[PDB]
Enzyme design. Structure first.
Site, PDB file in Angstrom:
ATOM      1  N   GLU A 233      30.642   3.182  -8.517  1.00 21.08           N
ATOM      2  CA  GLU A 233      30.178   3.744  -7.488  1.00 21.08           C
ATOM      3  C   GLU A 233      30.520   3.638  -6.149  1.00 21.08           C
ATOM      4  OE1 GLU A 233      26.971   5.407  -6.381  1.00 21.08           O
ATOM      5  OE2 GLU A 233      27.705   6.473  -8.177  1.00 21.08           O
TER       6      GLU A 233
ATOM      7  N   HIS B  65      34.099  10.631  -8.236  1.00 21.53           N
ATOM      8  CA  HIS B  65      33.710  10.521  -9.623  1.00 21.53           C
ATOM      9  C   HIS B  65      34.714  11.128 -10.768  1.00 21.53           C
ATOM     10  CE1 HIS B  65      30.189   8.008  -9.273  1.00 21.53           C
ATOM     11  NE2 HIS B  65      29.348   8.901  -8.627  1.00 21.53           N
TER      12      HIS B  65
ATOM     13  N   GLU C   4      24.030  10.109   5.450  1.00 18.57           N
ATOM     14  CA  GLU C   4      23.233  10.350   6.811  1.00 18.57           C
ATOM     15  C   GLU C   4      23.056  11.738   7.323  1.00 18.57           C
ATOM     16  OE1 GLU C   4      26.070   9.066   6.385  1.00 18.57           O
ATOM     17  OE2 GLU C   4      27.554  10.585   7.674  1.00 18.57           O
TER      18      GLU C   4
ATOM     19  N   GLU D 229      28.594   4.873   6.874  1.00 17.16           N
ATOM     20  CA  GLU D 229      27.164   5.115   6.341  1.00 17.16           C
ATOM     21  C   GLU D 229      27.281   6.146   4.882  1.00 17.16           C
ATOM     22  OE1 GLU D 229      24.348   3.250   7.472  1.00 17.16           O
ATOM     23  OE2 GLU D 229      26.083   2.470   8.050  1.00 17.16           O
TER      24      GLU D 229
ATOM     25  N   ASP E 244      18.579   1.550 -12.830  1.00 17.75           N
ATOM     26  CA  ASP E 244      19.760   2.460 -12.257  1.00 17.75           C
ATOM     27  C   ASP E 244      20.907   1.883 -13.216  1.00 17.75           C
ATOM     28  OD1 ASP E 244      21.268   3.672 -10.255  1.00 17.75           O
ATOM     29  OD2 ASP E 244      21.405   1.751  -9.043  1.00 17.75           O
TER      30      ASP E 244
ATOM     31  N   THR F 178      16.690  12.342   4.773  1.00 14.77           N
ATOM     32  CA  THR F 178      15.440  12.241   5.510  1.00 14.77           C
ATOM     33  C   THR F 178      15.603  13.041   6.889  1.00 14.77           C
ATOM     34  OG1 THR F 178      16.516  10.054   6.200  1.00 14.77           O
ATOM     35  CG2 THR F 178      14.819  10.035   4.441  1.00 14.77           C
TER      36      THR F 178
ATOM     37  N   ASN G 225      32.013  13.359  13.119  1.00 16.48           N
ATOM     38  CA  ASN G 225      30.888  12.154  13.544  1.00 16.48           C
ATOM     39  C   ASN G 225      31.173  11.293  12.286  1.00 16.48           C
ATOM     40  OD1 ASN G 225      29.523  13.443  15.218  1.00 16.48           O
ATOM     41  ND2 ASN G 225      28.568  14.722  14.043  1.00 16.48           N
TER      42      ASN G 225
ATOM     43  N   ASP H 259      19.161   6.999  10.061  1.00 16.00           N
ATOM     44  CA  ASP H 259      19.077   6.244   8.853  1.00 16.00           C
ATOM     45  C   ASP H 259      20.072   6.793   7.857  1.00 16.00           C
ATOM     46  OD1 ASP H 259      17.782   8.363   8.350  1.00 16.00           O
ATOM     47  OD2 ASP H 259      16.326   7.519   7.120  1.00 16.00           O
TER      48      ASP H 259
ATOM     49  N   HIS I 181      31.998  12.120  -2.435  1.00 18.73           N
ATOM     50  CA  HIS I 181      31.516  10.917  -3.448  1.00 18.73           C
ATOM     51  C   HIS I 181      31.677  11.516  -4.727  1.00 18.73           C
ATOM     52  CE1 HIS I 181      28.539   7.689  -4.545  1.00 18.73           C
ATOM     53  NE2 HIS I 181      28.301   8.736  -5.545  1.00 18.73           N
ATOM     54  N   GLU I 182      31.117  12.724  -5.050  1.00 18.19           N
ATOM     55  CA  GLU I 182      30.891  13.418  -6.318  1.00 18.19           C
ATOM     56  C   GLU I 182      32.260  13.736  -6.809  1.00 18.19           C
ATOM     57  OE1 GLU I 182      28.190  13.083  -7.557  1.00 18.19           O
ATOM     58  OE2 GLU I 182      26.975  12.763  -5.642  1.00 18.19           O
TER      59      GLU I 182
ATOM     60  N   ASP J 275      31.404   7.802   9.818  1.00 22.95           N
ATOM     61  CA  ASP J 275      30.766   6.616  10.043  1.00 22.95           C
ATOM     62  C   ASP J 275      31.011   5.825   8.720  1.00 22.95           C
ATOM     63  OD1 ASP J 275      28.715   7.406   8.279  1.00 22.95           O
ATOM     64  OD2 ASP J 275      28.117   8.644  10.003  1.00 22.95           O
TER      65      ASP J 275
ATOM     66  N   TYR K 119      29.937   3.457 -16.637  1.00 23.56           N
ATOM     67  CA  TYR K 119      28.782   3.662 -15.600  1.00 23.56           C
ATOM     68  C   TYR K 119      27.571   2.818 -16.012  1.00 23.56           C
ATOM     69  CZ  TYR K 119      26.722   6.082 -11.671  1.00 23.56           C
ATOM     70  OH  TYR K 119      26.103   6.810 -10.599  1.00 23.56           O
TER      71      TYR K 119
ATOM     72  N   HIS L 279      23.866   1.712  -8.089  1.00 21.33           N
ATOM     73  CA  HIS L 279      23.769   2.135  -6.611  1.00 21.33           C
ATOM     74  C   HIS L 279      23.389   0.838  -5.702  1.00 21.33           C
ATOM     75  CE1 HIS L 279      23.528   5.931  -9.013  1.00 21.33           C
ATOM     76  NE2 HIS L 279      24.380   6.459  -8.072  1.00 21.33           N
TER      77      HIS L 279
ATOM     78  N   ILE M  60      13.684  11.533   9.790  1.00 18.33           N
ATOM     79  CA  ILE M  60      14.115  10.197  10.295  1.00 18.33           C
ATOM     80  C   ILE M  60      15.333  10.288  10.942  1.00 18.33           C
ATOM     81  CG2 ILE M  60      14.187   7.674   9.784  1.00 18.33           C
ATOM     82  CD1 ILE M  60      12.100   8.249   7.556  1.00 18.33           C
TER      83      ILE M  60
ATOM     84  N   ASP N 227      28.895  37.641  -3.426  1.00 17.24           N
ATOM     85  CA  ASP N 227      28.602  38.141  -2.054  1.00 17.24           C
ATOM     86  C   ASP N 227      29.190  39.618  -1.519  1.00 17.24           C
ATOM     87  OD1 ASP N 227      28.773  38.155   1.310  1.00 17.24           O
ATOM     88  OD2 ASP N 227      26.931  37.184   0.636  1.00 17.24           O
TER      89      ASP N 227
HETATM   90 CA   LIG Z   1      17.531  10.922   8.160  1.00 17.30          CA
HETATM   91 CA   LIG Z   2      28.819   9.099   6.218  1.00 17.56          CA
HETATM   92 CA   LIG Z   3      26.820  38.232   2.763  1.00 18.15          CA
HETATM   93 CA   LIG Z   4      28.755  11.053   9.424  1.00 18.47          CA
HETATM   94 ZN   LIG Z   5      27.963   8.151  -7.438  1.00 16.42          ZN
END
Ligand SMILES: [Ca+2]
Ligand SMILES: [Ca+2]
Ligand SMILES: [Ca+2]
Ligand SMILES: [Ca+2]
Ligand SMILES: [Zn+2]
Ligand SMILES: CC(C)C[C@H](NP(=O)(O)CNC(=O)OCc1ccccc1)C(=O)NCCc1ccccc1
Length: 316
Positions: free
Chosen positions: A166, A146, A190, A187, A226, A194, A183, A200, A142-143, A185, A157, A231, A197, A57
């Site tokens: 997983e 792994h 999130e 989940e 899968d 989506t 924030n 979720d 998460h990644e 949680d 796997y 998963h 939506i 950059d």
């Molecule tokens: Ca969503």
């Molecule tokens: Ca989360």
């Molecule tokens: Ca820049």
């Molecule tokens: Ca969160």
């Molecule tokens: Zn994974």
């Protein structure tokens, strides 16, 4: 690259401003020298050849739309590094400060992210199922987790070992999300799932069944999709982990919660001292019980709660 450590500023996928550690040598590169042997973020330029080019950059300001996934991949890798070092005394994914590399803008409309054996890789999503996936701190953690798993337990796997693999990534993804404390949680995904939506997520650890994932061993998937449901069946272990931390009564079995920090200690010890590439769910239970025993004692509430949680999800 060789240069001097600098501090840039930019906006992430969700429009939030943050500072990032960069390196100056003609250009400002997404190279954070402050952590281990560096965190490096690359542009895959909508193609699939990896890693692509180290992100360069001109002005150390990263406010363009195209910059946002890079800002977050880079920044959240730093948070994840800090979590493992500060909480578990682990230096990068290999325990020896290996350079952490991520590529963003992988492929076109790519609704996934992964560890390819050597680096993290993030799609931009198609704008419907996902927005750029590095926008989720739980996803980035998460990644990277792994990579930790691959360097430690080495869980294969597929089938039960793969579902444990997983779940370990979901568990530590969530613990890192709580560590950053924005924030948080139980989940998964999130923040990037989506955009049309609200409310979720891709998976739920607190109630895996809300998305059709099993929350009891008797509901496990045994087909071939899968990689044998890695998963999907992760929900059984995610639920156990959630119960250990938060408590609850599940299929009539009551679990006394012991909190996130102890969950993290127990599972980190299991992952690094007890699990093997072929561990199944029953062996995970044994590993967690032994880990809690090492840390807190055989007569402890922590050990009792681990047993309760695995009982609740039907794993003996
Ligand atoms: Ca969503
Ligand atoms: Ca989360
Ligand atoms: Ca820049
Ligand atoms: Ca969160
Ligand atoms: Zn994974
Ligand atoms: C945290 C999440 C956002 C990303 C997570 N990505 P991941 O698990 O790392 C894949 C696989 C592989 C890739 C390279 C080398 C070896 C093996 C995931 O759950 N990905 C799966 C997302 C999905 C897709 C279709 C249906 C259900 C769920």
């Amino acid at each position: 690259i060789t240069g001097t450590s600098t501090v840039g500023v930019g906006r992430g996928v969700l429009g939030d401003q943050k500072n990032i550690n960069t390196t100056y040598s003609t250009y400002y590169y997404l190279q954070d020298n402050t952590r281990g042997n560096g965190i490096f973020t690359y542009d895959a330029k909508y193609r699939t050849t990896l890693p692509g080019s180290l992100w360069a950059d001109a002005d150390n300001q990263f406010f363009a739309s195209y910059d946002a996934p890079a800002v977050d991949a880079h920044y959240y890798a730093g948070v994840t590094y800090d979590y493992y070092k500060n909480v578990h005394n682990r230096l990068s994914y290999d325990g020896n400060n290996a350079a952490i590399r991520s590529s963003v803008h992988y492929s076109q409309g790519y609704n996934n992210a992964f560890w390819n054996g050597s680096q993290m890789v993030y799609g931009d999503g198609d704008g419907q199922t996902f927005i750029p996936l590095s926008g989720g701190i739980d996803v980035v953690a998460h990644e990277l987790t792994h990579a930790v798993t691959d360097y430690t337990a080495g869980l294969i796997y597929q089938n039960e070992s793969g579902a444990i693999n997983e779940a370990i990534s979901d568990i530590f993804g969530t613990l890192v999300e709580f560590y950053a404390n924005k924030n948080p949680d139980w989940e998964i995904g999130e923040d990037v799932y989506t955009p049309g939506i609200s409310g979720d997520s891709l998976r739920s650890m607190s109630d895996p069944a809300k998305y059709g994932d099993p929350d009891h061993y008797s509901k496990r998937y045994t087909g071939t999709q899968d990689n044998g449901g890695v998963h999907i069946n992760s929900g059984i272990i995610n639920k156990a982990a959630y119960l250990i931390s938060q408590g609850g009564t599940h299929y009539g079995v009551s679990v006394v919660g012991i909190g996130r920090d102890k969950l993290g200690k127990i599972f980190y010890r299991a992952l690094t001292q007890y699990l093997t590439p072929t561990s199944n769910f029953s062996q995970l239970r044994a590993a967690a019980v032994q880990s809690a025993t090492d840390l807190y004692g055989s007569t402890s509430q922590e050990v009792a709660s681990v047993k309760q949680a695995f009982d609740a999800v039907g794993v003996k």
